[PDB]
Amino acid sequence: KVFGRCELAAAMKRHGLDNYRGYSLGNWVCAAKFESNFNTQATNRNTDGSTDYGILQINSRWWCNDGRTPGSRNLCNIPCSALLSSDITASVNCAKKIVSDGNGMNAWVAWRNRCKGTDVQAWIRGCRL
C-alpha cells in the first residue's frame, strides 16, 4: 500500500506514534517519506546481507527475522514480512522499540540526514487530525 501523506499521519497517530519518545508526528511522516516513499511493501538489501522492510525500512540485522541474515537478531519478535502489511501496526510497534533503544530517531539514517532539524511540521501541514 502506498499511503498519502495525511493518510499516513492519521494512521500513525491512531497507533500512538505522535510524540512517541518526544518525536512529533511530522518527524515520523518525514522518516517514512524518505525511507519508503510511503510504500508499505518497500524492501532494500544492505551491503552486509541484511534487508530493510516496510514503511520505516526496519532492518533484519536486529529487529525482525527474515531467515537469511546470519548472526542477526529479531528484537521485535516478528517475521520481517509482517512489516510489509497494508496495516502499519507491526511496523509501528517495532519502531517504538527502535526509537527507545538509545539513539532516538538517529537509528533511521535517512531521518538524520534528511529530516533532523528541518521544518518537519510541513509533513502534517493541512492534515485533518
From Swiss-Prot:
Boundaries of every C-type lysozyme domain copy: 1-129
GO cellular component, as recorded: cytoplasm; endoplasmic reticulum; extracellular space
GO terms assigned for molecular function: beta-N-acetylglucosaminidase activity; identical protein binding; lysozyme activity
E.C. number(s) listed in UniProt: 3.2.1.17
GO biological process, one term: defense response to Gram-negative bacterium
Tissues where this protein is expressed: In the egg white and polymorphonuclear leukocytes.
Catalyzed reaction equations: Hydrolysis of (1->4)-beta-linkages between N-acetylmuramic acid and N-acetyl-D-glucosamine residues in a peptidoglycan and between N-acetyl-D-glucosamine residues in chitodextrins
Record's keyword terms, sorted: Allergen, Antimicrobial, Bacteriolytic enzyme, Disulfide bond, Glycosidase, Hydrolase, Secreted, Signal
Residues that, per the record, bind substrate: D101
Domain of life from the UniProt record: Eukaryota
Positions annotated as active site in the UniProt record: E35, D52
Cellular location(s): Secreted
Disulfide pairings: C6-C127, C30-C115, C64-C80, C76-C94
Subunit composition and interactions: Monomer.
Further facts: Lysozyme C is capable of both hydrolysis and transglycosylation; it also shows a slight esterase activity. It acts rapidly on both peptide-substituted and unsubstituted peptidoglycan, and slowly on chitin oligosaccharides.
Main function: Lysozymes have primarily a bacteriolytic function; those in tissues and body fluids are associated with the monocyte-macrophage system and enhance the activity of immunoagents. Has bacteriolytic activity against M.luteus.
Name listed for the protein in its UniProt record: Lysozyme C
Organism expressing this protein natively: Gallus gallus (Chicken)
Gene name of this polypeptide: LYZ
